[PDB]
């Protein structure tokens, strides 16, 4: 079933490299900017968006009024939300690169994210654009056994649970 997943725009936290979970930042100058460019490049679909605001601004700006769902919420990295990943521990990094094993205290496990997302996505009746964070956008892309890793601002479009159609990133 075809659905875009859309990375919001940036966030002062995506420009210093801080883990951004459920931590409610706003999107930069930059972000809104990269938003509106989307405005026009996805295709008009019903709308899903995580309910944090970089989200919902993103859809807005993109030129939707998304239906909202926490189920496509960023991975809740409890206790270390906001920390540099410069800093982060050998384990940690590698758990996170890895994508495999991790749960930050006063958080969510990865294994929790990942039943999260794909049970949404199951639940989808029709092709859809879905606003969402870059952990989502990676956790999908990663089950379908590609590189997770899009810009701010961009999106994918996919076959769930088949194949990646397309990744859109716009200048």
């Known amino acids: ?7 919001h725009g940036e966030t ?15 999107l930069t100058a930059e972000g809104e900017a990269q938003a509106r460019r989307l405005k026009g490049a996805l295709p008009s679909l019903p709308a899903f968006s995580s ?5 919902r601004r993103t859809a807005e700006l993109a030129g939707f009024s998304p239906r909202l769902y926490p189920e496509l919420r ?19 990094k590698e758990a996170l690169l890895r994508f495999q094993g991790f749960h930050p205290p006063g958080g969510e496990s990865l294994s ?4 999260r997302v794909f049970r949404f996505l199951e639940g989808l009746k029709a092709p859809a654009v879905l606003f969402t964070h870059g952990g989502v956008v ?12 899009v810009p701010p601002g961009s ?5 769930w649970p088949r194949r990646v159609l397309v990744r859109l990133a716009l200048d």
């Open 155 to 159: 999106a994918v479009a996919v076959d």
């Open 1 to 7: 079933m075809e659905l875009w997943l859309v990375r």
């Open 138 to 149: 990676r956790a999908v892309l990663r089950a379908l056994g590609e590189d997770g890793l």
């Open 112 to 115: 929790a994210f990942q039943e």
């Open 51 to 55: 309910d944090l605001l970089r989200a």
């Open 74 to 92: 960023e991975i809740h990295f409890g206790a270390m939300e906001g920390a540099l990943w410069e800093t982060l521990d050998p384990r940690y």
């Open 12 to 26: 002062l936290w995506n420009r210093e490299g801080r883990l951004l979970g459920w931590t409610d930042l706003p």
